[PDB]
Write a protein that binds this ligand. Structure first.
Ligand code: SAL
Ligand code: SAL
Lengths: 677, 677
């Protein structure tokens, strides 16, 4: 009453059409828009040199008073977590532990130059290292001994050198693939990664890492299973060898879990003014090695040790570009998996801080990091999750924290490093699992998605299962394709609702859920909140016939039955509706006198040939019975998809469309009134 | 002016909500609806016995006066086409030619009992026979000779017996798979077969059949290539052996092409009163064998001959159920391909004749036909296209035409059959290719789809290429998945249009295409005709910022720049909008004074967590700038997906939704007026 007064003529498709005229729509430089491109203006080249290389954006516009201290503390904490994590994922890749430090040094600084993100700790990610180890073991199995000229002892250095070479080759291929896709504007694919998809995939990866590193801390040595059901085989191999373990390895492993627990207690025990957000991992690892040395558990009970760490920067060496023909498949796998994880982490942290990250630029930077690392004896690299979260939470606000972490790792790899010699894998195990703590707390997504929407739970659980029992490349591909199939499903089980009319107004709402929307007499309105295409075409027609209670086949059957029982003694010059071929008797079953069916197309986004054909069949059938059909809510896309197909041959069909549900209702009533003459 | 007078109060989501109340919605027998099921009423059991076995629907309700003659003529024509086609596809499957007659006899009558369709000629389909031949050759290669005790000559009968056994095994597995899927209500999958998908897939199959049977009529013998790029290898093998051909084989092959051409001329030459729609194939094959015998081309130039046809019905024999472990993959392939083709043909012919066919019931019937045929030495069976089209066009109106064709084939296989002994493969080649004529004319879909819609052309061409260069199982799977990906694409490139307002009315149309829809001042309206979900979330936000000309990031940047240049001398107690933190100067760039952004959700079918998050970000950003955001066109699904996620924490957010674009516009104007106090 207060507002919303319109009082306009009924806009049938023809009426509204003549009350409009088309604009020129003349585009500028049709076909070849590139003439306005290829300009040498300083601004465009400046933007190009910014976007292909974003280091020139930070150093000029770099605040010093507050960014520096946060960068220092974040860099210290990140490097602290980088060291044992790098060593652990190095030995998880069946390579000498030093290459973990190599991986923690070179790609980090190169990404700091080329990466587009402010909270990411580039480094040796667990799953990428696990794939590297899988291929390295597969091509160089432990029972293949290449006889040299020495024959001194059963030296493993030849095997490890071959493993390093094959790792270098596969990582070069991953870098080349990532660079090619990045320059091919392939970073748009980073959008088919839903939040539950990434959550479940990374959680499954956490389970994989947990089981493998669990094999490590027990002191038991078993075969490195890989492929489908890899985690099952690995964990049953560990359980089959729960016996003959190393008791002191568990002693120190639970002891360093104990120092983490006493670290949470240490936050309440020893802190007055000095302790910063201390990287408890450094004190944990130092205490572990010191306590192990003092208690004499290695020399008395033979705990496994990280091993000799050859000091010195190794010179660059061109890798053998001849293993590609038998490593390319899982090189593709590693590239895709690493890019997906790092871009998801970057996007997730880009919402907390307001800025944005360029996906394909991230692809280019990560690929160049991997390639040049391959040149410098470095296995494959992406964004780890625990380290990146630690760097963000500590307070770093520029990639200089990563640069400082790389500086610390360089200091470890060049000057010092003798102290980390006598270090047990149990400490590394605890470091990794504690880093897995939050990633495992991430199962809280299941009840929340169960309450919120079960399709998101379906994507989450499917991603979890496919990335747990199958591999992780195959799990990722299956999870993405299921994600797209779930979107498809959501258009094949829509909300078929029959619309009533709110009294005295033009608002139309579901009839059988509000008890105040008594439907207009003589009219049935059917609405689908989904596009009408091939995969949802016959479902729509069947639902229309079933739900409205108006079945043309049943009506014709009843009509011929009643007629049988009664007798006991222009170029398309076709009217779309047929009259009633009845003598107006009462033998037929008295149902309703519905005379028009108003299909709602306000929610129908698009149509195709099959949908056009099925509406043609619907209109033809209801016209044969004697029931008009009006398509309400005509849009540009719907009428375009109806005109392109030979639907609007216009016997009268252009007069059926209406621009609103109320427009169709009023048109039907006006036509009925004009028929009562 | 004439109609459409409403004059209602502005229905914001809170206002509309209180003017409604929910109905009870109490469902009947929640959870366990099966208590009302499992009833023994005669009607339900009658419908069950009808639906699992539809032979009891025709014989009772069978008109005799007009159906009989059409059934006779259609059955004669169909059996005529069945004989040479069956023999040709038998020898195309690397089996003795009699099994073509076996395949044309048993499954036809069994489908006549169990099938649900009135225009289908069940029989030895070309592609299914080609897959059968591929597996039979693969498991029994031509260079594997099993030495018996005879050693008389290089007898091929042992090889052919092994080929028959392996064909029987794979066909039993296909029948079992089809029956299991049919009883598992898997016939719903028959809806992911778009018209262009089937058209292109069958056209590619026609190309495959053309090339293979082309190998046949040249009289040249080459290796039967199979796998990926199978057609390329086969045709280059034929071209490599164009030399050393059989000249008389081409003579008779082009001669019977000549008799087909003279048959089109014969329609105008010899027809006064007697000739029915004659099955020209019978006269063609009889004339071919008679002319070849009279002209003495075999005995003088050694043309290839069909071979001895052992007369007599062979007794049933249980097939070896031990090859399954190495035939199951392409048994699955054959089952899926055959079911897809036959269901597409049935659905296509079910629209020309008004009735309907049950997909999963077709699966059950076809599977039982294949299984029992496997019991009776019969290779795999589905619906051929040329024969089915011939049967429909001739005039048959019940599956009794197929039964009559089976009777004719039985007469050929039992009483007669000696006449078909001296028959050349060239006649069979011409029969098959002429049957391919229309299937090749089916390329007319390309320009038509180019004019109509290029997504349907994309599905057509992708299906063609994937089913031509790759295999046909792999081609079908790839084509279907691309079909679903095209549906996905259609929601990632929607029509982002800014809406103006038709003067004096409430109709909102695209602003920059009609020159009469001058937009309401101070308001920008943005509309997407697509759901807002993960795969189309950031595209929507970027398009909203870019297309409306309102960028919050640019506005904040300009605001801080102007401020810098100026200085030359409840539990969520947050207001969603922030006021203007400006001293009202002129240094900032004077653009537009847009104060609200009305997003259109009438076309948005659904949402998820990512879409809810991105609208939250949009609202928060524009509120920080000082611009209101109103979601127009609230629907049940959209508000449900907004309430389930923690979007409606209601600081004031429940007041932003509106039920129509005009409602949002009037609400914005009223609020602005109330602000000018
Ligand atoms: O860095 C890890 O150890 C890790 C591994 C898999 C998943 C998430 C992670 O943080
Ligand atoms: O019957 C055939 O030969 C045929 C083969 C492939 C595709 C369509 C067909 O009609």
């Amino acid at each position: 009453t207060q507002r919303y007064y319109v009082e306009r003529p009924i806009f049938s498709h023809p009426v509204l059409q003549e009350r409009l005229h088309k604009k020129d729509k003349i585009s500028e430089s049709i076909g070849d828009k590139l003439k306005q491109a290829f300009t040498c203006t300083p601004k465009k080249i400046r933007n190009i040199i910014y976007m292909f290389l974003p280091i020139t954006k930070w150093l000029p516009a770099y605040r010093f008073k507050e960014y520096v201290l946060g960068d220092i503390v974040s860099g210290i904490s990140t490097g602290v977590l980088q060291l044992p994590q790098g060593l652990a994922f190095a030995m998880l890749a069946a390579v000498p532990p030093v290459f973990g430090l190599y991986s923690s040094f070179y790609p980090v600084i190169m990404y700091c130059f080329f990466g587009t993100s402010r909270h990411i700790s580039i480094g040796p990610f667990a799953v990428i290292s696990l794939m590297i180890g899988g291929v390295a073991v597969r091509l160089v199995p432990d029972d293949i001994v290449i006889p040299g000229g020495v024959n001194a002892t059963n030296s493993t250095e030849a095997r490890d050198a071959l493993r390093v070479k094959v790792a270098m080759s596969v990582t070069l291929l991953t870098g080349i693939i990532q660079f090619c896709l990045g320059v091919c504007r392939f970073g748009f694919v980073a959008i088919y990664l839903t939040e539950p998809l990434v959550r479940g995939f990374t959680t499954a990866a956490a389970v994989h890492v947990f089981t493998s590193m669990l094999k490590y801390l027990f002191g038991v040595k078993t075969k490195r299973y890989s492929g489908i059901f890899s985690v099952v085989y690995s964990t049953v191999a560990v359980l089959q060898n729960v016996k003959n373990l190393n008791v002191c390895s568990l002693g120190v492993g639970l002891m360093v879990f104990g120092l983490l627990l006493g670290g949470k207690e240490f936050n309440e025990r020893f802190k007055e003014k000095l302790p910063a957000p201390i990287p408890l991992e450094f004190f944990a690892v130092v205490m572990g090695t010191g306590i192990s040395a003092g208690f004499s558990l290695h020399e008395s009970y033979n705990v496994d040790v990280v091993g000799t760490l050859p000091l010195g920067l190794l010179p660059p060496a061109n890798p053998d570009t001849s293993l590609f023909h038998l490593v390319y498949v899982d090189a593709i796998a590693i590239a895709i998996v690493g890019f997906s994880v790092t871009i998801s982490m970057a996007k997730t942290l880009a919402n907390k801080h307001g800025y944005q990250v360029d996906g394909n630029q991230e692809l280019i930077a990560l690929g160049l990091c991997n390639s040049t690392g391959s040149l410098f004896q470095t296995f494959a690299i992406s964004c780890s999750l625990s380290r990146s979260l630690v760097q963000e939470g500590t307070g770093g606000k520029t990639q200089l924290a990563g640069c400082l972490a790389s500086l610390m790792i360089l200091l470890v790899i060049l000057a010092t490093g003798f102290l980390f010699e006598s270090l047990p894998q149990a400490v590394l195990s605890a470091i990794v699992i504690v880093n897995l703590k939050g990633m495992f707390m991430q199962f809280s997504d299941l009840p929340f998605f169960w309450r919120t929407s079960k399709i998101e739970l379906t994507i989450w659980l499917t991603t979890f299962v496919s990335s747990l029992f199958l591999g992780l490349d195959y799990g990722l591909i299956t999870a993405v394709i299921i994600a797209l199939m779930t979107v498809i499903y959501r258009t094949q089980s829509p909300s078929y609702i029959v619309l009533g009319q709110l009294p005295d107004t033009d608002v139309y709402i579901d009839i059988d859920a509000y008890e105040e929307v008594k439907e207009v007499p003589g009219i049935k309105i059917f609405q689908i909140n989904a596009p009408i295409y091939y995969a949802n075409s016959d479902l729509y027609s069947s639902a229309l016939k079933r739900k409205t209670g108006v079945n043309p086949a049943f009506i014709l059957g009843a009509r011929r039955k009643a007629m049988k029982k009664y007798a006991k003694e222009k170029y398309p010059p076709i009217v779309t509706k047929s009259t009633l071929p009845e003598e107006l008797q009462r033998f037929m079953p008295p149902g309703d006198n519905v005379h028009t069916i108003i299909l709602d197309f306000t929610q129908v986004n698009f149509m195709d040939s099959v949908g056009v054909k099925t509406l043609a069949g619907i209109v033809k059938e209801y016209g044969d019975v004697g029931i008009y059909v009006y398509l309400a809510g005509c849009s540009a896309q719907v009428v375009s998809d109806l005109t392109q197909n030979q639907f609007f041959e216009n016997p009268a069909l252009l007069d059926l469309l209406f621009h609103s549900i109320h427009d169709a209702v009023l048109g039907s009533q006006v036509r009925e009134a004009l028929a009562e003459q």
